[PDB]
Amino acid sequence: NMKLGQKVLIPVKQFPKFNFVGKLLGPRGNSLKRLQEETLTKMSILGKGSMRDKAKEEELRKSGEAKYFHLNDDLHVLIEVFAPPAEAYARMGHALEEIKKFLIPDYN
Amino acid sequence: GAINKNMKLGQKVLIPVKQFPKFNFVGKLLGPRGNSLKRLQEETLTKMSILGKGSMRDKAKEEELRKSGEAKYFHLNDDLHVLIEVFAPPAEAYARMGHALEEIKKFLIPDYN
């Protein structure tokens, strides 16, 4: 068994008005949690703008604690997997395909 | 990274030489009758190279290259392995890697064929 991790950009700069976080979570907040289970991965929204309170986010980023280093990156989904190699890579490929629709706007 | 942007992946697969020191792993992968590594690359859309200690079967040259300190020979410091590489968009890169990792398994299990 091995761990894989892959960041996937949430393209905020490119589409600054689209509610990506709401798209990812769905109206009940369940959607990303469900998708991680469907693909046998773990998926977390990390990076700048990923905390609810902007001021706290800046404090945490300035703290320099390792657990907040992610706050220096652009907003992203981190997909992680732990499985035997062939299966780890397959799960990641599946997750990467499934996440696509949530990372582009669905209206102009 | 961006979901659509082509990316490189690389993954080492150990060849179990110490466990099976009389079995010719390399010959079987490279032999002209099987063309087995070539075929595996084509079927999986990955690229594969045999690297690490013993990958040259010219032990003296291998040592000289290891001792040269040239970056292209750093791999000689690792145990014998297949390096599987791919360049594709992320979803496809990972899926192709997974297919390659499944398909290589049969070459790493010694039998009498």
Author numbering:
A (entry chain A): 53 to 160
B (entry chain B): 48 to 160
What does the paper say about this structure?
T-STAR is a tissue-specific STAR protein mainly expressed in the testis and brain3426, and regulates the alternative splicing of CD44, Tra2β, Tau, VGEF and Neurexin pre-mRNAs262728. STAR proteins are defined by the presence of a highly conserved RNA-binding domain, the STAR domain, also responsible for homodimerization, and composed of a central KH (K homology) domain flanked by two highly conserved regions, QUA1 and QUA2. Here, we have determined the X-ray structures of the T-STAR KH domain in its free state, and in complex with AAAUAA; KH-QUA2 in complex with AAUAAU; QUA1-KH in complex with UAAU; and the full STAR domain in complex with AUUAAA. Taken together, our data reveal a unique mode of RNA recognition and dimerization by the STAR proteins Sam68 and T-STAR that is crucial for their function in alternative splicing.
The KH domain of T-STAR adopts a classical type-I KH fold very similar to KH structures of other STAR proteins. A comparison of free and RNA-bound structures of T-STAR show that the presence of the QUA1, QUA2 and the RNA do not induce any global structural changes of the KH domain (backbone RMSD ranging between 0.44 and 1.05 Å). Surprisingly, the KH domain and the C-terminal half of the QUA1-KH linker of T-STAR provide an additional dimerization interface. This novel KH/linker interface covers 1,065 Å2 per monomer, almost twice as large as the QUA1 dimerization interface, and involves mainly the C-terminal α-helix 3 of the KH domain and the C-terminal half of the QUA1-KH linker. The KH interface is stabilized by a network of hydrophobic interactions involving residues A138, Y141, M144, G145 and L148, and an intermolecular hydrogen bond between Y141 in α-helix 3 and Q58 in β-strand 1 of the KH.
